[PDB]
């Protein structure tokens, strides 16, 4: 049986969306020329499909963020008073002094990630939601969680002190509420220390988002570099061929260049769709994780951080989202002799809620996740059956507190 | 003279022996906003990346938007322009461009001895 | 698009294959036929790849629908915001052309009132905690009630359990506990 506990804080990194890219078929393939455009026209439509695919990808990229973050009906604002039962929500809540409405951890996150081609017909669209709105959304979620609990998600937000909210979470995971109220200072100090450790470790990781950015950067660079290959033509510059050869000869040279560039563009588009599918799956997982761990408690194991889950707070990262799970893990232990049932007068006495333990001389009944021995009484136990059916049963007595009263 | 993309961008004059630069002319995509063809025939062209110094006028981070007025207020998004701007038709009617509104803001009276 | 792609020259002299067959000697028409072969093969490959990519997403959506059907319909789920907004009660399925439509019945509260609370009440120097509810006071008296509905009830020795003494509790107030056994004893 554990006799203590430690509060742990973890982090998880989940990419949400990527860059919205636009590519022009005609300017890339041919450019300023008109003979090349006329030749390309004979290929039916190998531009409309590419434009449609890229526009669909961009719309999906916007939808991922809209689904992940826009989960709150009203933008709550934290009250000025900071009497959160001893807890320190100052490295997470926004600081208006900074030019942006971000917080310390968010600022460390954006400073950690570091993010010509436009002349070739490759352009990058801007995100639909600028980072200020995302910061406002996350601040609203934090304020709702802190000042209301999980009630704000279900309906209208309901105020409640933070101490009783933490007591509700404790009672949810299987530890009676008196444990929190008796050990409030220790838990507050442990949580503050965990937040401090997270902040210190982050300053001095973010591999997922960096790799997501690097993949697109390398893909665009490869697409740009593919424009220099001859593909079997005499020269890789269309103007050079046009000014140096007759149209009847220049046509057959331009055909090979057109085929090569069209093939490269097809490859790039296919890779982009394959990557966007995976990003969509990750964004859906992130939305589910937010809606489950943040807006309420979770009974799923290992879903929201290792250990038993208490509460979580979201943070915003460039092209991603960060969760700070707060968990409850057991601590220093002790051996204990145990027994299934207690035999009193030919009647078994199963424990109503808890276990039967004994250090070697006296028997006690106590909860599973914390150690607080109590005397066996009629309120802790219920009788059922005889003393022969149970495989292992230990003789002892039961207090029955009614007898002293009648004296 | 070349660059990372390996395209001729700097040339030396064969006559005067001086250094020049090469830069392709400005270009970008064109996007149109329409409130539908059942209420009006009005539109509002949006140039993708051209600065408004080049070829009503409302310079945005997303690009130049002409044909639509700009207002102080903030309503729910109707047309996803980009960079936190959304246009709409309802203002005798004209297109307007504004900033997104996240939603109504409320503050809950949180005190250490109060419940709901 | 796949059908309309059949009407392009692809570099040959004509689009329909019959004209190529009739107008030219096959030893010269072989290259003209080869051009169309290449173009149409490329178009078919593009269409097939797009279809596979779309089928993956439809499969994922169908798996999600199956999970929601198995969890919301065949029982009650405690996963927040999964089986509809609000607390979840029960769901019914309906059919649709190439899809499924659910009807989530949800329980949502309204018309809230505010109150004053205390973490615990101590009567004779020992702190009492609520077993399953929360202590609320309307201004003169203290009652214990469940945390999702307002049904005040007089605080007794059956709504509370003692734990230690009322000095460690950061917030504590004075009150009385009914102790129903004593009045019946007399
Ligand atoms: C449970 O563990 C905590 C540590 O988190 C113990 O609290 C520390 O106790 C030592 C010894 O008295 C003090 O020096 C520390 O200041 C305490 N706090 C911390 C944060 O270390 C606590 O004593 C343990 N429980 C029991 C019953 O001993
Ligand atoms: C097992 O725990 C019980 C707790 O009740 C211990 O009982 C105590 O024993 C000492 C020594 O005889 C008495 O002075 C105390 O009054 C007893 N009660 C309490 C609450 O301390 C018992 O000693 C423990 N077993 C062993 C082997 O130490
Ligand atoms: C809080 O609720 C109690 C419920 O008992 C109210 O006390 C009752 O008030 C009415 C009207 O004055 C009396 O007729 C009853 O006899 C009272 N019950 C008692 C004293 O047990 C109390 O007034 C309420 N507080 C308010 C409304 O401020
Ligand atoms: C919270 O911690 C910061 C430093 O981490 C400190 O400056 C601030 O005073 C603390 N707040 C409270 C209420 O103790
Ligand atoms: C419990 O008993 C086992 C068996 O001897 C021992 O290995 C273990 O260390 C004991 N627990 C503690 C906390 O000492
Ligand atoms: C319990 O007591 C009964 C009667 O006193 C006896 O028959 C039985 O063997 C005892 N069991 C143990 C484990 O002492
Ligand atoms: C145009 O759209 C509006 C919007 O509902 C509709 O009321 C109207 O009947 C439509 N007109 C035609 C000709 O379809
Ligand atoms: C457009 O050009 C003007 C004039 O130089 C400049 O002040 C402005 O910043 C430019 N627009 C952008 C978005 O930089
Ligand atoms: C916003 O308000 C300011 C202050 O009067 C005004 O100068 C500006 O023109 C307004 N923006 C509009 C009308 O788009
Ligand atoms: C909270 O309750 C007090 C009385 O207990 C009342 O004066 C105040 O107006 C209430 N605040 C609300 C309902 O926001
Ligand atoms: C609640 O906060 C007030 C300050 O507004 C303070 O006087 C009071 O002691 C606090 N009570 C508890 C139980 O935290
Ligand atoms: C009422 O509560 C106060 C708070 O400490 C305490 O000092 C006082 O003794 C309590 N009343 C009685 C009758 O014990």
Author numbering:
A (entry chain B): 714 to 828, 852 to 940, 944 to 1146
B (entry chain A): 566 to 620, 641 to 676, 689 to 713
C (entry chain A): 961 to 1146
The authors write:
The SARS-CoV-2 spike glycoprotein is the major surface antigen of the virus. Its function is to bind the host receptor ACE2 and mediate the subsequent membrane fusion required for cell entry. Here we have examined the structures and receptor-binding properties of spikes of the B.1.1.7 variant first described in Kent, United Kingdom (now termed Alpha)10,16–19 and the B.1.351 variant first described in South Africa (now termed Beta). Recently emerging variants of SARS-CoV-2 have acquired other substitutions in the spike including a number located at the monomer-monomer interfaces, at the receptor-binding site, and near the furin-cleavage site.
Third, the most striking feature of the structure of Beta spike revealed by cryoEM is that all the trimers adopt an open conformation. This is in contrast to our earlier study, under the same conditions, that showed 83% of Wuhan spike particles were in the closed form. Again, solution equilibria cannot be extracted from these data but we interpret this near-complete switch in states as indicative of the open form of the Beta variant being more stable than the open form of Wuhan. Inspection of the sequence of the Beta spike and comparison of its structure with that of the closed form of Wuhan spike and the open and closed forms of G614 spikes, suggests that the opening of Beta spike could be driven by the substitution K417N on the background of G614 (both also observed in the Omicron variant spike). In Wuhan, Lysine at residue 417 on the RBD not only makes an aliphatic packing interaction with Tyr-369 of the neighbouring subunit, it also forms a salt bridge/hydrogen bond network with Glu-406 and Arg-403 of the RBD and with Ser-373 of the neighbouring RBD that stabilises the closed conformation. In contrast, the substitution of an asparagine at position 417 in Beta removes an intramolecular salt bridge and would generate a steric clash with Tyr-369 of the neighbouring RBD leading to destabilisation of the closed form and thus promotion of the open form. In the same way that G614 is a prerequisite for realising tighter receptor binding by the substitution N501Y described above, it may also enable spike protein from the Beta virus to achieve an open conformation as a result of the K417N substitution. In the Beta variant spike, the presence of a new substitution, K417N (also observed in the Omicron variant), in combination with the D614G, stabilises a more open spike trimer, a conformation required for receptor binding.
